Design a protein around this ligand. Structure first.
Ligand SMILES: Cc1cc2cc(C#N)cn2c(C)c1Nc1ncnc(Nc2ccc(C#N)cc2)n1
Length: 412
């Protein structure tokens, strides 16, 4: 019934961010949603004296036909003061990523039951644009905790704790984590038992008085991790050996003891690329030692919470993508691959967008925060099409790589 005082970072004004073009469908959806939100008092109209703006658009969650309002709060989130609660910060559960199965639940509607600090409300302003700007955009601001804002989980946390207390005390083995609008509940239980406990939890949440019927099931135990592998052949061409030496040279930036000398000795002389070259004993041994080295993990790879997670993605063709999450160059915290087909067969951007979402989810389950993506796409293409395929209630940060990486085929 009482609002907690909120302010921005020192020397920082509120966000002013242009509303990007919206399609007719999304505009109608947002009008219909915001009308009812206004009726329910969640939002209120504002006047010209509010300069601030945050972009808004519409999406659809996993397996649903219902439009959902998504506000992109990234600017406000980085401009709003770092919010440390009575918690003094929560250690991110390291058991969450070790659980057999992890279900994602949307708790977002709970935020709307808690009022927002009056003086900060002006900073949450947003616009529903009109087609061809033929009418003034409809301007709103939030009277309650907005979805997507950094302050909402921080503020609501004290409530969420005592809301989840009975369920947590009843099932102590279950690990629960909260990121933005999402509640991640992991456990080792069988899928049926898991789903029953999940239904139990959402029913318990609805009894606590808070679309929560959805769920998203991961399996961190079955997650993809990639060692560096070398080919095994009975016959090597000059080309094969050249590619091998290239890969080993690249892998020597990671693993110290990699030696290409005896293998490069075979490349001496100018021969046809397709000519078969028999391996000398020294070369074979060198290769063996190299494999041995490649089986061990990387030296001195640690996660530092003070730094940024960086995710790189490569398009390998045939609907296949490779990715690496890392902090420092050639120190890989995680690597993986996606062959996924969901409605994505002919569309590169749909694939890349789903990939970005999955990687972000993984990164949230593991380190409790989102990576900065380097996307193998032109800025204009991505900026144009990514919102069409976005199903997630959060958004990460991204940049663009316009020069083809040589390391592409070395990860495939
Ligand atoms: C009604 C309207 C009038 C108007 C006058 C001026 C000026 N100067 C700019 N205007 C805009 C943007 C309008 N808004 C609006 N909304 C939807 N359809 C239209 N069509 C339309 C408008 C004018 C003319 C003529 N002559 C012909 C067709 N206009």
């Amino acid at each position: 019934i009482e609002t907690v005082p909120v302010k921005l970072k020192p020397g920082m004004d509120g966000p002013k961010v242009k509303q990007w073009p919206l399609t007719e469908e999304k505009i109608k959806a947002l009008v219909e949603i915001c009308t009812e939100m206004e009726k329910e008092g969640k939002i209120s109209k504002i006047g010209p004296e509010n300069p601030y703006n945050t972009p808004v658009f519409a999406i659809k969650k996993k397996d649903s036909t219902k439009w959902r309002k998504l506000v992109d709060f990234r600017e406000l989130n980085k401009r709003t003061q770092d919010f440390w609660e009575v918690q003094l910060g929560i250690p991110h559960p390291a058991g969450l990523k070790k659980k057999k199965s992890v279900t994602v639940l949307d708790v977002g509607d709970a935020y709307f039951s808690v009022p927002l600090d009056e003086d900060f409300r002006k900073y949450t302003a947003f616009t529903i644009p009109s087609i061809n700007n033929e009418t003034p955009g409809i301007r709103y601001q939030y009277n309650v905790l907005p979805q997507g804002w950094k302050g909402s989980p921080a503020i609501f946390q004290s409530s969420m704790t005592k809301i989840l207390e009975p369920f947590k005390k009843q099932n102590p083995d279950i690990v629960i984590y909260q990121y933005m609008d999402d509640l991640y509940v992991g456990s080792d239980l069988e899928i049926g038992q898991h789903r029953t406990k999940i239904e139990e939890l959402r029913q318990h949440l609805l009894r606590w008085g808070l679309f929560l019927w959805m769920g998203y099931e991961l399996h961190p135990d079955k997650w993809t991790v990639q060692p560096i592998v070398l080919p095994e052949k009975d016959s090597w061409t000059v080309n094969d050996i050249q590619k091998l030496v290239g890969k080993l040279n690249w892998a020597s930036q990671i693993y110290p003891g990699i030696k290409v000398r005896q293998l490069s000795k075979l490349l001496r002389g100018t021969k046809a690329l397709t000519e078969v070259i028999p391996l000398t004993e020294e070369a074979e041994l060198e290769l063996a030692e190299n494999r041995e080295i490649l089986k061990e993990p990387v030296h001195g790879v640690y996660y530092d919470p003070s730094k940024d997670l960086i995710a790189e993605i490569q398009k390998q063709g045939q609907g296949q993508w490779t990715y690496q999450i890392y902090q420092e160059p050639f120190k890989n915290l995680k690597t993986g691959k996606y062959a996924r087909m969901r409605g994505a067969h002919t569309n590169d951007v749909k694939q890349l967008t789903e990939a970005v979402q999955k990687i972000t989810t993984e990164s949230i389950v593991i380190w409790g925060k989102t990576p900065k993506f380097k996307l193998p796409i032109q800025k204009e293409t991505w900026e144009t099409w990514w919102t069409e395929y976005w199903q997630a209630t959060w958004i990460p940060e991204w940049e663009f790589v316009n020069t083809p990486p040589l390391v592409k085929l070395w990860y495939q």
